[PDB]
């Protein structure tokens, strides 16, 4: 359970782009989406939710 939770909560989820090819006409916004990033400090690791 600990290994699976670490794998789930220490991932590199690729959100994508808020408006990207093929985009709609008259589209005037383009930005990247950030969902998750890999943890960096033991304090963050110790806060992983097991249950």
């Amino acid at each position: 359970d600990v290994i699976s939770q670490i794998k789930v909560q220490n991932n590199q989820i690729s959100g994508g782009q808020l408006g990207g090819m093929p985009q709609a006409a008259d589209q005037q916004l383009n930005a990247s989406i950030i969902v998750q990033t890999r943890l960096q400090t033991p304090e963050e690791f110790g806060k992983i939710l097991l249950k």
Binding site: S14, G15, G16, Q17
Partner: protein, 50 residues
Amino acid sequence: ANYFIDRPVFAWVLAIIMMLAGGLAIMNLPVAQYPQIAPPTITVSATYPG
């Protein structure tokens, strides 16, 4: 050296051999705009969709 003056046929034969070798070279010699000037570089490309 100077001994070709006594033997014109040897000089003419050498000239003919040179011309034939040059024609053979021109027949099969690679041509290009420029030779390999840039140092070799290797490119590694990876894609992570999204």
